[PDB]
Amino acid sequence: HHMPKVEIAPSEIKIPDNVLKAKLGFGGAEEIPEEFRKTVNRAYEELLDAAKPVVLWRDFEVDGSLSFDDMRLTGELATKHLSGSKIITVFLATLGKKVDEKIEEYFRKGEDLLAFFIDGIASEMVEYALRKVDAELRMKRSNLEGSFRISPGYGDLPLSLNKKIAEIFKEEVDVNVIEDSYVLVPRKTITAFVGWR
């Protein structure tokens, strides 16, 4: 069972200013207002201290079919992007449980705005961690065409798949879906598929 993983230093994850700015309520603003500069700085500084970005993946040889290790991709979105492909990669990206604990710590102290900045930078940090690796795999694999990246719960793709993917990486990383609504723990954890023609 070949389960590669990369650990990425939080400061090496470049989130574009306008994506950040939009995520924290300053969509379009040319700059983040001076009144929130020190706060956002601390949110981002706190996040850098607590986050432990890890992205893991696994390649399956499938040739055309949309079923493999214990799962079967069902919706119409799946077919559009993933059908007729030789390999399908499943990704898991996470920032770890200390991120969750820091968010809760600030809600508990009643610093809800700070916790909001942190939660939002964190949502984008785990996305761009995944994108960083998605891109490396694209650049390496010249002999192939990578599909669009799709996550469980987007369109017709069952959210229930989170549970299947969690199981795949259970031994490589601290992750569960302890909730029967298929919600991943730790909370800043994200899943995706990419197809390769």
Alpha helices in the chain (DSSP H): 17-23, 37-50, 76-82, 97-108, 112-140, 161-169
Q: What are phi and psi of 58, to 5 degrees?
A: -155, 130
Are 42 and 114 spatial neighbours (Cβ–Cβ below 8 Å)?
yes
CA nearest to 196, candidates 149, 154, 158: 149
50: tokens are 């607590």
Q: How many Å apart are CA 30 and CA 151, to the nearest integer?
A: 31
If residue 90 lies in a helix (H) or strand (E), which one and from where to where?
strand 87-94
Q: Spell out the domain ranges in the chain.
A: 1-197
Resolution (in Å) of the shown entry? Answer: 2.3
CATH class held by domain 1-197: alpha beta
Experimental method used, please? X-ray
